[PDB]
């Protein structure tokens, strides 16, 4: 199961110049395209090896469309400021998210386009790709515009067409890096807090993709009430890592096991502290 997404963010800075526009593209963690308005020469610059093999016409049209997105989102910042009757000295943020999800077979199962204003959902495209969902009375106006122009047809055409086709193309040009499955290297650590209590920590390092399941079990029974579980953080080299700790009494620490499930595993793993 894969996907391809494009994000954007427009942040206004009054008295500090024109609002900043940034745009990025990912395949399912992997940034391969970046645009920054504060760069020296704003262009759609590559961020992955399997995309640099595209010709200059690709980057030329990408930069053209991205510049159009920047100016359009700046006019959107001014427009939404008019909807909400806001001051001209306040900084505001406008975020955008488009993408398409490909199932196990390779055909579209989900596609979406979403807009947020100041960290709050503003305008969403429903799953039927033919209707909109507005969050407030000011978003109803943008909804009526999208219904008047019937842009859901062009949006559905991109999500069902270009998005899926170029997702396949990106997956084939980057098969060695994107369709890989690195299993996590696992080990369990021990940390006393004081006498009669200890902390068992189950580690999973250097795996891909990001999704993983770490579970602690007391005598083969899940313990998901008293477990610390950090959110999956990136290592910095394209891999991910995660740990899960539980507090156990001193002596009963052999009754605890770490059941770790990952895609790259040939089968689920079960760990126990070794000292």
């Amino acid at each position: 199961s894969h996907s391809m997404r494009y994000f954007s963010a427009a942040v206004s800075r009054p008295g500090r110049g024109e609002p900043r526009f940034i745009a990025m593209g990912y395949v399912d963690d992997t940034q391969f395209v970046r645009f920054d308005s504060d760069s020296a020469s704003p262009r759609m610059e590559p961020r992955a090896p399997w995309v640099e093999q595209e010709g200059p016409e690709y980057w030329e049209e990408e930069t053209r469309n991205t510049k159009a997105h920047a100016q359009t989102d700046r006019m959107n910042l001014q427009t939404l400021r008019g909807y909400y009757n806001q001051s001209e000295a306040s900084s505001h943020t406008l975020q955008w998210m488009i993408g398409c999800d490909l199932g196990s077979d390779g055909r579209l199962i989900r596609g979406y386009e979403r807009y947020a204003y100041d960290g709050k959902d503003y305008l969403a495209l429903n799953e039927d790709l033919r209707s909109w969902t507005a969050a407030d009375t000011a978003a109803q106006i943008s909804k009526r515009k999208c219904e008047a122009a019937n842009v859901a047809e062009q949006r559905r055409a991109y999500l069902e067409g270009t998005c899926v086709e170029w997702l396949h193309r990106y997956l084939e040009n980057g098969k060695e890096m994107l369709q890989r499955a690195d299993p996590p290297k696992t080990h369990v650590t021990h940390h006393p807090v004081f006498d009669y209590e200890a902390t068992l920590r189950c580690w999973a390092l250097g795996f891909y993709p990001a999704e993983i399941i770490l579970t602690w079990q007391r005598d083969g029974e899940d313990q998901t009430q008293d477990v610390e579980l950090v959110e999956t953080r990136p290592a910095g080299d394209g891999t991910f890592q995660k740990w899960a700790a539980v507090v156990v009494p001193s002596g009963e620490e052999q009754r605890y096991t770490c059941h770790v499930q990952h895609e790259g595993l040939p089968e689920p793993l079960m760990l126990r502290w070794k000292q």
């Binding site: 159009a68 997105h69 959107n76 386009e113 515009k145």
Partner: peptide, 9 residues
């Protein structure tokens, strides 16, 4: 490949 047109809110 990014979508050509942005929405006008």
């Amino acid at each position: 490949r990014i979508i050509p047109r942005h929405l006008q809110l």
